[PDB]
Structures are given as structure tokens and as C-alpha cells.
């Protein structure tokens, strides 16, 4: 049975550790997989920050070219039950 985030693999940044289990579960309810820390399987890295952010984990993921999205990407995908465009939710996104 189709779910909107099938084949997505989320990883919540260390910065967002207090929200990590909750966000993993929100992603999983939409059919995504999740990793507890970053690796080569991750498709979507959840992160909140600033222009030219110096966070080490963020910079390492950015080098790998995977999607880096605000937590609001996941929250809005959940509200809509849809795979929403990642480009609308950069790490600097603020509602």
C-alpha cells in the first residue's frame, strides 16, 4: 500500500537531538526509513540553521549533495499526507 515517503531515508541532525525520536516516528508514519546518525543511505537530513552555517555535521552532509531540509518539510508532509517539494524547505526556512 502506497505511502508518500516510501524510499526516503531521514536522519535528524545532532542539533535537533531532543526532537529526534519524534521526527523519526513522524517520517516512519509516512513510510520513510530513518537512521540514528548520518551515513550513505540517508536521502534527507533534517537541519535548522543560518546562511554559511559552520556546523560540522551540516557541512559534511552538504558536501555529499543529499537533501538538507527544515523540520517543517517533515511536519508539512505529515499535515498534507504528501511528499512535498524539498526546495521549499531549506535549512534557513522560517514559517
From Swiss-Prot:
- What species is this protein from? Homo sapiens (Human)
Q: How is it modified after translation?
A: Phosphorylated on serine and threonine residues in response to X-ray irradiation.
- Placed within the complete protein, the shown segment runs 901 to 995 of 1522
Which purpose does this protein serve, as stated in its record? Scaffold protein that acts as a key protein-protein adapter in DNA replication and DNA repair. Composed of multiple BRCT domains, which specifically recognize and bind phosphorylated proteins, bringing proteins together into functional combinations. Required for DNA replication initiation but not for the formation of pre-replicative complexes or the elongation stages. Necessary for the loading of replication factors onto chromatin, including GMNC, CDC45, DNA polymerases and components of the GINS complex.
- What are the BRCT domain coordinates in residue numbering? 1-91
Reported tissue expression: Highly expressed in heart, brain, placenta, lung and kidney.
Protein name per the record: DNA topoisomerase 2-binding protein 1
Specify the domain of life of the species encoding this protein. Answer: Eukaryota
Quaternary assembly: Interacts (via BRCT domains 1 and 2) with (phosphorylated) MDC1; promoting TOPBP1 recruitment to DNA damage sites during mitosis. Interacts (via BRCT domains 7 and 8) with (autophosphorylated) ATR; promoting activation of ATR. Interacts (via BRCT domains 7 and 8) with (phosphorylated) POLQ; specifically binds POLQ phosphorylated by PLK1, promoting POLQ recruitment to DNA damage sites. Interacts (via BRCT domains 1 and 2) with (phosphorylated) RAD9A. Interacts (via BRCT domain 2) with (phosphorylated) TP53BP1. Interacts (via BRCT domain 2) with (phosphorylated) HTATSF1.
- Which gene holds the coding sequence for this protein? TOPBP1
Family, according to the entry, reads as follows:
Belongs to the TOPBP1 family.
UniProt-annotated location(s) = Nucleus; Chromosome; Cytoplasm, Cytoskeleton, Microtubule organizing center, Centrosome; Cytoplasm, Cytoskeleton, Spindle pole
Induction info reads: Up-regulated during the S phase of the cell cycle. Up-regulated by E2F1 and interferon.
The free-text domain remark for this protein reads:
Some BRCT domains specifically recognize and bind phosphoserine/phosphothreonine marks on proteins. BRCT domains 1 and 2 bind phosphorylated MDC1 and RAD9A. BRCT domain 2 binds phosphorylated HTATSF1 and TP53BP1. BRCT domains 7 and 8 bind phosphorylated ATR, POLQ and RAD51.
Amino acid at each position: 500500500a502506497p505511502k508518500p515517503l516510501h524510499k526516503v531515508v531521514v536522519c535528524v541532525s545532532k542539533k535537533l537531538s531532543k526532537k529526534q525520536s519524534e521526527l523519526n516516528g513522524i517520517a516512519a508514519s509516512l513510510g520513510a526509513d530513518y537512521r540514528w546518525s548520518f551515513d550513505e543511505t540517508v536521502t534527507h537530513f533534517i537541519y535548522q540553521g543560518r546562511p554559511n552555517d559552520t556546523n560540522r555535521e551540516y557541512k559534511s552532509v552538504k558536501e555529499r549533495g543529499v537533501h538538507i531540509v527544515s523540520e517543517h518539510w517533515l511536519l508539512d508532509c505529515a499535515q498534507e499526507c504528501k511528499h512535498l517539494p524539498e526546495s521549499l524547505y531549506p535549512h534557513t526556512y522560517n514559517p
